[PDB]
From Swiss-Prot, chain A:
Originating species: Human herpesvirus 2 (strain HG52)
Subcellular location: Virion; Host nucleus
Name recorded for this polypeptide: Capsid vertex component 1
Subunit structure: Interacts (via C-terminus) with capsid vertex component 2/CVC2.
Disulfide bond residue pairs: none
Function: Capsid vertex-specific component that plays a role during viral DNA encapsidation, assuring correct genome cleavage and presumably stabilizing capsids that contain full-length viral genomes.
Signal sequence annotation: none
Swiss-Prot record, chain B:
Post-translational modification: Proteolytically processed, possibly into several polypeptides. Enzymatic activity is only detectable following cleavage of the UL36 protein, which occurs late during viral replication.
Intracellular or extracellular location(s): Virion tegument; Host cytoplasm; Host nucleus
Family of this protein: Belongs to the herpesviridae large tegument protein family.
Record's function text: Large tegument protein that plays multiple roles in the viral cycle. During viral entry, remains associated with the capsid while most of the tegument is detached and participates in the capsid transport toward the host nucleus. Plays a role in the routing of the capsid at the nuclear pore complex and subsequent uncoating. Within the host nucleus, acts as a deneddylase and promotes the degradation of nuclear CRLs (cullin-RING ubiquitin ligases) and thereby stabilizes nuclear CRL substrates, while cytoplasmic CRLs remain unaffected.
Name of the featured protein: Large tegument protein deneddylase
Coiled coil feature spans: none
Subunit description: Interacts with host CUL1 and CUL4A; these interactions inhibit the E3 ligase activity of cullins. Interacts with inner tegument protein. Interacts with capsid vertex specific component CVC2. Interacts with the major capsid protein/MCP.
The organism of origin for this protein: Human herpesvirus 2 (strain HG52)
Included stretch of the parent chain: 3075 to 3121 of 3122
Length: 70, 47
C-alpha cells in the first residue's frame, strides 16, 4: 500500500486508482475493509483513526446532553 | 613458458574479479535505499 501509492504518488489511498485499488485487492485480500466499506465505524487510512473513534463519542454525548438540557 | 605466462595468469584473473564485484555493488546498495525512498515519501503519505 505504500509503493502502490508512492510510485503512483497517491497521497491518500482513497484517491487510489480503481485498477490500482483492485490489483492490490487481488494481491492482499484483507484490505476490502479499509477500501470498500460504506461507513466503517473506524476511519480507513488515518493515524488518529482510533483517536477520531473516541472524539465522536465525546461529541455525540454533548449534543445528547446539550439538546436534553434545553 | 610456465614461468612467463604463469606470472601472468596470476595477474589476468586479479583484475578480472575486482571489476566483477563493481557490477554487484551497484545493485545491492540502492535496493536498500529504495525502501528509504519508499518510507521518506510515505511520511507525507501519512499526511
Amino acid at each position: 500500500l505504500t509503493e502502490a501509492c508512492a510510485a503512483e504518488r497517491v497521497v491518500r489511498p482513497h484517491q487510489l486508482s480503481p485498477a490500482a485499488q483492485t490489483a492490490l485487492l487481488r494481491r492482499f485480500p484483507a484490505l476490502e475493509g479499509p477500501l470498500r466499506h460504506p461507513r466503517p465505524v473506524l476511519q480507513p487510512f488515518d493515524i488518529a483513526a482510533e483517536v477520531a473513534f473516541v472524539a465522536r463519542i465525546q461529541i455525540a454525548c454533548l449534543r445528547a446532553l446539550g439538546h436534553s438540557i434545553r | 613458458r610456465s614461468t612467463g605466462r604463469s606470472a601472468l595468469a596470476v595477474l589476468i584473473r586479479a583484475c578480472r574479479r575486482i571489476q566483477q564485484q563493481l557490477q554487484r555493488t551497484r545493485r545491492a546498495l540502492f535496493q536498500r535505499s529504495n525502501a528509504v525512498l519508499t518510507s521518506l515519501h510515505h511520511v507525507r503519505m501519512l499526511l
